[PDB]
Amino acid sequence: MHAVSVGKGSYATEFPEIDFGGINDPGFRDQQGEPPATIYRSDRVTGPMQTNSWWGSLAVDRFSMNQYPHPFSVRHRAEGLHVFYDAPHNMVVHENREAGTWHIHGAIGTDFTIKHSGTANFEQAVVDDYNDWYVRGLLENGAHQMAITYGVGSPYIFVEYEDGSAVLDFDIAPDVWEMNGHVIGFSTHDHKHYAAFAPPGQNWSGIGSKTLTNNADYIAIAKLPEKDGNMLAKFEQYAYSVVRDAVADWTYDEATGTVTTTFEVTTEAKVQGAPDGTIFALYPHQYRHLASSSENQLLQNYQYEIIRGTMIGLEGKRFTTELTYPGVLPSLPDLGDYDRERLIGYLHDATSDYPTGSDTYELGKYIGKLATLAPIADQMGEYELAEQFRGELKDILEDWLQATNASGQLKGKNLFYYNENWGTILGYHAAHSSATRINDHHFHYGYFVKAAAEIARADQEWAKSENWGGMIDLLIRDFMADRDDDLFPYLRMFDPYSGNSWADGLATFDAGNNQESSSEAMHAWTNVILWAEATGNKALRDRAIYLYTTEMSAINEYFFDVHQEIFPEEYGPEIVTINWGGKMDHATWWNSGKVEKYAINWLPFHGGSLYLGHHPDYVDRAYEELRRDIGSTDWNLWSNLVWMYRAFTNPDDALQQMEASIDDYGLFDPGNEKIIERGSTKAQTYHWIHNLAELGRVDPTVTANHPIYAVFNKNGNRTYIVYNFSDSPITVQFSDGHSIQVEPHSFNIGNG
Ligand SMILES: OC[C@H]1O[C@@H](O[C@@H]2[C@@H](O)[C@H](O[C@@H]3[C@@H](O)[C@H](O[C@@H]4[C@@H](O)[C@H](O[C@@H]5[C@@H](O)[C@H](O[C@@H]6[C@@H](O)[C@H](O[C@@H]7[C@@H](O)[C@H](O[C@@H]8[C@@H](O)[C@H](O[C@@H]9[C@@H](O)[C@H](O[C@@H]%10[C@@H](O)[C@H](O)O[C@H](CO)[C@H]%10O)O[C@H](CO)[C@H]9O)O[C@H](CO)[C@H]8O)O[C@H](CO)[C@H]7O)O[C@H](CO)[C@H]6O)O[C@H](CO)[C@H]5O)O[C@H](CO)[C@H]4O)O[C@H](CO)[C@H]3O)O[C@H](CO)[C@H]2O)[C@H](O)[C@@H](O)[C@@H]1O
Numbered sequence: 207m208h209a210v211s212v213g214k215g216s217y218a219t220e221f222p223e224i225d226f227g228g229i230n231d232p233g234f235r236d237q238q239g240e241p242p243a244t245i246y247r248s249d250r251v252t253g254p255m256q257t258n259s260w261w262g263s264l265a266v267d268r269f270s271m272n273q274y275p276h277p278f279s280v281r282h283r284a285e286g287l288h289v290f291y292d293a294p295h296n297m298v299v300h301e302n303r304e305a306g307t308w309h310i311h312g313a314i315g316t317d318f319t320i321k322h323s324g325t326a327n328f329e330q331a332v333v334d335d336y337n338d339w340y341v342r343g344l345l346e347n348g349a350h351q352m353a354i355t356y357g358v359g360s361p362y363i364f365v366e367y368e369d370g371s372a373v374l375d376f377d378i379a380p381d382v383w384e385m386n387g388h389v390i391g392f393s394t395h396d397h398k399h400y401a402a403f404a405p406p407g408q409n410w411s412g413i414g415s416k417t418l419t420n421n422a423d424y425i426a427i428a429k430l431p432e433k434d435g436n437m438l439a440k441f442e443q444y445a446y447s448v449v450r451d452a453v454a455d456w457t458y459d460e461a462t463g464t465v466t467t468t469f470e471v472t473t474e475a476k477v478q479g480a481p482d483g484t485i486f487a488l489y490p491h492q493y494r495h496l497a498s499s500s501e502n503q504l505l506q507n508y509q510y511e512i513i514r515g516t517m518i519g520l521e522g523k524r525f526t527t528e529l530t531y532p533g534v535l536p537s538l539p540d541l542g543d544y545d546r547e548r549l550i551g552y553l554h555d556a557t558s559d560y561p562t563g564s565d566t567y568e569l570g571k572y573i574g575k576l577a578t579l580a581p582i583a584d585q586m587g588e589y590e591l592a593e594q595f596r597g598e599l600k601d602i603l604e605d606w607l608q609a610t611n612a613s614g615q616l617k618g619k620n621l622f623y624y625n626e627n628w629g630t631i632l633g634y635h636a637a638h639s640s641a642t643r644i645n646d647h648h649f650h651y652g653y654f655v656k657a658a659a660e661i662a663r664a665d666q667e668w669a670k671s672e673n674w675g676g677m678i679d680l681l682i683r684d685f686m687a688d689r690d691d692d693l694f695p696y697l698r699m700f701d702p703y704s705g706n707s708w709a710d711g712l713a714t715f716d717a718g719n720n721q722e723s724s725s726e727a728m729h730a731w732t733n734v735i736l737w738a739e740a741t742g743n744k745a746l747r748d749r750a751i752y753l754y755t756t757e758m759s760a761i762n763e764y765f766f767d768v769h770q771e772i773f774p775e776e777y778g779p780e781i782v783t784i785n786w787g788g789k790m791d792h793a794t795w796w797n798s799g800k801v802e803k804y805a806i807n808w809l810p811f812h813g814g815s816l817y818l819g820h821h822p823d824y825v826d827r828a829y830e831e832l833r834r835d836i837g838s839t840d841w842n843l844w845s846n847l848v849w850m851y852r853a854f855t856n857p858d859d860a861l862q863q864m865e866a867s868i869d870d871y872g873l874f875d876p877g878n879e880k881i882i883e884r885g886s887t888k889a890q891t892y893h894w895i896h897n898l899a900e901l902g903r904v905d906p907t908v909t910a911n912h913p914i915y916a917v918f919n920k921n922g923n924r925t926y927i928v929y930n931f932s933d934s935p936i937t938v939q940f941s942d943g944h945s946i947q948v949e950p951h952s953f954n955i956g957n958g
Pocket residue numbers: 229231232233234237271272305307562563564565568635637638714715716717718784791793794795796797798
């Protein structure tokens with residue numbers, strides 16, 4: 207057998223003979239491959255391999271690339287582990303005016319190297335263990351081993367030796383300003399403050415020289431917030447508690463909308479009586495939302511400066527964050543003051559649209575487009591057109607979700623394949639290194655889930671597990687599996703601690719991992735919420751709610767900097783386009799103009815997009831900066847996306863710009879995205895802007911006791927929107943005291 211049946215569909219278990227469709231282009235052909243054969247992991251790491259992580263380069267490269275376990279940067283090498291900290295003098299903000307790009311970055315330097323007394327010629331560094339956000343890297347050379355435990359949000363690096371002892375090697379002799387024998391407080395020549403800890407009685411030697419040595423088979427390194435002896439004493443308390451387990455456990459309180467996440471470590475004692483706990487370094491998206499019960503654990507003056515702003519210290523076994531899920535919708539309802547016949551015209555115009563490629567991404571954009579059009583067609587009373595759209599979605603999905611052709615043999619394209627080596631579903635044709643690097647599975651498969659959710663909204667039978675739902679559930683498991691999934695690692699895309707998704711499967715860059723389109727991540731989470739609600743899968747829905755809500759908190763900090771605290775004052779733009787572990791760029795992965803470096807973090811527009819309007823002052827600030835740089839409202843590309851975004855705070859302005867230019871060009875044209883972005887339509891644009899004009903501003907201050915809703919506020923007048931996926935009527939309670947009844951399979955208002 208070369209395929210596994212899942213309901214009416216199947217996935218391939220053997221790499222297919224790819225149908226290249228006569229395309230000779232080497233770039234295209236190279237995309238139709240598999241992720242690396244070699245995984246640098248020990249035999250202690252078994253089953254589906256974790257990917258899309260901040261630490262991924264350890265698994266892919268023989269050693270590693272540069273990594274960002276904030277507050278540190280580290281890299282594995284034959285000689286040992288290089289440790290670095292970007293001080294203010296290491297940080298730069300550069301603009302390339304001609305490219306239209308900006309870059310906030312540090313250096314790839316070495317403050318010191320953690321070394322093993324027995325060898326400076328390790329053969330490889332492997333993943334020996336990992337948990338929700340820490341990794342254990344193992345440098346190996348026969349009997350000589352050095353195990354390094356580190357993580358994002360850990361001011362400790364824990365070092366365990368086999369057949370040797372500790373060495374810290376420096377290019378310029380450090381200033382050892384506190385010598386407690388087994389504990390040392392030290393500074394680099396350029397005044398970066400660190401500490402090293404060994405068991406009592408194991409004293410440091412070589413003070414005043416370039417090489418600090420210790421006979422111990424265990425040391426910890428800490429980054430100190432300050433050259434402060436009291437802080438050193440505090441770090442000493444947790445320096446011998448090596449993190450083994452780390453979990454981010456969450457709950458969703460449906461009644462209140464509260465997503466509660468508890469981050470909990472389990473440590474192993476390296477000396478008698480070492481506490482079960484650590485010192486955490488919290489990111490802004492965490493500490494801005496710290497639970498009251500965690501406040502007492504904060505170490506107030508323990509601050510670290512990093513790319514993502516200020517980290518703060520917190521001591522103990524666990525801490526808790528509290529966030530608010532704002533709801534999502536399957537679409538905007540029919541509440542706009544549009545010319546209905548004009549909208550009908552645009553809906554029929556959209557039948558000329560076609561996918562601009564055969565790969566999962568371009569096909570994804572097309573099916574997202576059709577899924578967006580179908581509820582608008584329904585609302586306008588174009589019921590057969592809506593059915594045509596959903597029929598076309600059915601045809602496409604029923605093709606892609608089957609791995610075998612009529613003869614029973616594997617297809618050459620439009621299929622999914624399970625790579626057993628890593629443990630991931632890959633789609634062919636592939637693009638953006640979705641197969642070769644395990645990239646972007648949330649971005650691509652999110653569109654497939656969108657299509658499935660729209661089908662399920664009208665046809666529950668299709669969506670059943672024994673029919674086509676099984677295969678959709680498989681795609682979702684690939685990118686956001688629960689724990690103990692036999693086929694996939696836990697929550698592939700998501701970093702529970704950094705608070706965001708990472709797009710690159712391999713992370714083999716010296717800036718760590720990256721994410722560009724945070725909105726396509728949010729699109730994926732939205733669609734899983736919708737799909738799971740439609741198919742009555744509460745556990746899956748809640749997981750997607752947790753992801754949507756957490757990612758939102760990271761987006762507002764690191765992509766948007768809504769609070770105006772993170773980006774350097776000298777940084778011109780009002781958005782970071784690509785977030786990396788170690789840097790921030792106003793730039794795109796492809797060659798683009800001015801609009802795209804903003805709008806790649808807005809697209810696509812859908813019923814889960816309302817998170818983009820929670821901060822009206824930000825929306826204004828970002829729009830005004832883009833307008834300033836353009837010099838007018840003559841957008842270089844994707845005009846409709848700018849209008850839709852503008853409509854969050856000024857729909858009159860959005861409407862005026864739309865009226866002037868929407869009809870500039872006629873039917874679908876792949877070569878011309880000046881007015882209409884290729885994943886968008888005139889129909890969507892017109893429907894969105896007019897809806898916003900009537901509804902007013904997004905109102906995030908009101909929650910509901912059901913998950914599929916939105917609240918708008920126009921000069922004090924609230925509009926409450928709920929979609930009911932149930933066969934039964936429901937009552938929804940809003941947090942401001944308002945209450946509504948909703949009929950089965952309908953909006954409460956604006957069904958059309
Ligand atoms: O249905 C399917 C459909 O599919 C189609 O198939 C397609 C197919 O067409 C295509 O074919 C290819 C052709 O398209 C191609 O034609 C090109 C054309 O693309 C190009 O366009 C130019 C634009 O690309 C360009 O855009 C700019 C962006 O590129 C730029 O992106 C930047 C990133 O670069 C940057 O990345 C950095 C990263 O580099 C860095 O990496 C580190 C390494 O450098 C380092 O190396 C070390 C070294 O440092 C040391 O000194 O030495 C050692 C030596 O051993 C070395 O190892 O290693 C470290 C790790 O240790 C690395 O880290 O890492 C950092 C992070 O750490 C990373 O940042 O990242 C930034 C973001 O941060 C990103 O912005 O960005 C700018 C700004 O936005 C952008 O402008 O722009 C110019 C114009 O200005 C364009 O010209 O043009 C050329 C020339 O005209 C064309 O040739 O040709 C190739 C063949 O060569 C084809 O493959 O292929 C795709 C798949 O790829 C396929 O899907 C079919 O066609 C279709 O029919 C079908 O229907």
